[PDB]
Point group: D2
Chain length 238, copies 4
């Protein structure tokens, strides 16, 4: 009910239907979505937590305006937060079951690669990549860490598979997935070996793949900008 309200409202913000700087109010938003006030209230609050809306001082909400600096900083925060989770898992240790689970996801991700450099199941990688980053966040067994890492990924343009959309299935991106999969293996290896410094460094570097993919799209493939939701609304971008 409330979840269905979040999806539609998020879609209207990211499409540019509700532009940056636009003021949103409980009743006018409920009329727009043709949904009851209770789910709409949950949706507006959830999208504030997610970072798409800001609260206005006298009540109501405002659609946030993002710059390139915001995208780069969001990717940085996510990498730094995932690096913390990986380091703490290596320092504290991981349970037999949790390790078996994440190692199974890495093995499934290996099945997305073939003989030629381009032979990669892009859609299969993107779905399993989300699972790997979820399991990595929970690895150290801390709810506080899991919540803070998940919040850092909820943030705009900070999702692990955000720069891997189905329609951005290009050669240059498929070749870069082999290096990314080697990073997943290295994070788990470092955690097993109790090498916190390595686990953190690899997780931070791994997040920077998103920034490289973004920079590739601006300089070499600008038609791919519209494939990332909301990215074409960032006026700054170039």
């Amino acid at each position: 009910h409330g979840g269905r309200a979040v999806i539609e409202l998020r879609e209207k913000i990211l499409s540019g239907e509700l532009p940056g700087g636009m003021r949103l109010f409980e009743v006018s938003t409920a009329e727009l979505l043709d949904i009851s006030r209770t789910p709409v209230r949950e949706a507006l609050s959830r999208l504030t937590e997610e970072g798409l809306l800001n609260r206005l001082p006298g009540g109501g909400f405002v659609v946030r305006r993002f710059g390139f600096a915001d995208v780069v900083d969001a990717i940085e925060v996510r990498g730094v937060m995932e690096g913390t989770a990986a380091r703490l898992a290596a320092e504290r240790g991981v349970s037999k079951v949790a390790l078996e689970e994440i190692d199974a996801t890495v093995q499934q991700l290996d099945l997305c690669f073939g003989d030629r450099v381009d032979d990669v199941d892009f859609d299969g990688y993107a779905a399993l990549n989300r699972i790997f980053h979820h399991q990595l966040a929970a690895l150290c067994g801390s709810e506080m860490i899991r919540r803070e890492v998940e919040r850092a990924s909820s943030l705009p343009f900070a999702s692990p598979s955000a720069f891997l959309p189905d329609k951005a299935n290009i050669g240059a991106f498929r070749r870069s997935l082999r290096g990314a999969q080697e990073q997943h293996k290295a994070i788990v290896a470092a955690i097993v070996a109790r090498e916190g410094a390595r686990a953190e460094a690899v997780a931070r570097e791994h997040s920077r793949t998103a920034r490289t993919n973004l920079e590739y799209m601006i300089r070499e493939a600008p038609e791919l900008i519209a494939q990332v939701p909301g990215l074409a609304l960032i006026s700054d971008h170039h």
Copy 2:
């Protein structure tokens, strides 16, 4: 503005322990408690979810977040890691002449809190100026996204920079530890000026571990000090 007296009153009742961890809150029962209308109560319950004091229940309603010792240790870790990011980015990107003069002035004022003997420290003066230093450090790299994320990491009562420095916890062991902490403040600024991001990050992370060291000293050696420290009311 900003949720009014409703958000303030409801936050005060959660932090005092009046509304304990695990307690379920609903629109109507909360409105009866605050003797306010439904609209300002709905804003308050939503705002405190965004702030991280409440969690949403799957079938509607809210639940007061419960915190344990592990949560305090992890919050201090996240704060250090976030401050370390701000310090590293300030060193990598560079800092404006005005912003550097401001932070360096706070460090100079903090130096005036120290005397001849190891215990000769103005504890209340350090705590107030320490809050300013950490605020200024968060804004140094010039990024709003970083400043917001660092301030959020510092927002819980026990994750605050001066949280483990309350006026009544003015003990000898804690005054001796402030000299090392002040040397860390100087080192963070020096590393930023020198464009040494790695050092700036490492010092900021280590500096935050002082809070954990001071917390661990209480649990083991002075448990009567637990009640005096804010945030430790949300703990069991």
Copy 3:
């Protein structure tokens, strides 16, 4: 002449012709290499600095014995030393000329690769990889750092290009990731991101350890193609 004596002496140690525990003396070594004593003296001293020989009290050298732990530790030290050079270059800054030179090496390394990994210049990569690691060591402009980094890379089994016949499908695929690391080190140095520059340079040295561990577990016939590796007991 002295450099020629070092190559010939190093080759006999790494082939196992001069086994570990063997005692070497100026005269007997000069008779063996059929070279004058002065270049042989330089060679014996240079190989002590490099870590292949140990000095005996009273003169004379002894050929060192190496274990897998020695290889693992050498690679660790090299990565840590290269990470220092990369971090200091990012923190201090690099001159326009030095940055153009190292970036030209990276561009030449790209020409070792095509569209596919089927035809990748393995011998070409190894030669240019040595140049990249030489320039990276000198980037921060410190002679002290350059000397300590080159020493850490002279060390046994620590060399950056640690294999003409060992040219398999897998080791060719791993050179693409290694080249992306070279690009990332330079990018981090340009961007003044010391932390990143250090982390990438450390992780880059670990590729050697990963490739060593692959041969032992999956391709032991490739052990004889690595110089001196066939002498270690594991």
Copy 4:
């Protein structure tokens, strides 16, 4: 080795380089060096070569040796390398683990170092700290149980200015240096704590930061106390 003519020449020749008797930039040849030490040609050749391996001399392209010259930049870079090498030993000890006996030994040195401090900020046994500080850094290098790593930290700490207690000589016992020892002792405690807790990242970061104290103390002598330069037996090698 000290009893051999070869070993005796290394001790005497090292002493003349470190005293400044043989200054930086001085070309040393087999003959001139042998006349100086009044020793035969063969032990001199061993001596000259051993000090090149040691890093005190450099080889000249057309034959012969040159006394290696050191500048302020070289001292700063040497302290950086030592911190980076000690940080590696501390990180590897935390990652691998340390035996019960080795931990009890280093923790005993930390406890002995705590006995060097009193009530006032200046109340510090400077000579007692310097001797025990050498033991702590010795014990720290060996902690991970790797011989190559121990040797590598040993080498990084071998130049007279790259030594852990080099910037703590008996004659440089000043107020501004005694106050800095309290922070340094807290870092010794933090390195051991990080190793026990298996926190390699922290162990490395603290060991690197700890080494920067030596740079801070050096910079203080140059900018504020230049009369202290000559009384540090280790800064004699410095040109400018």
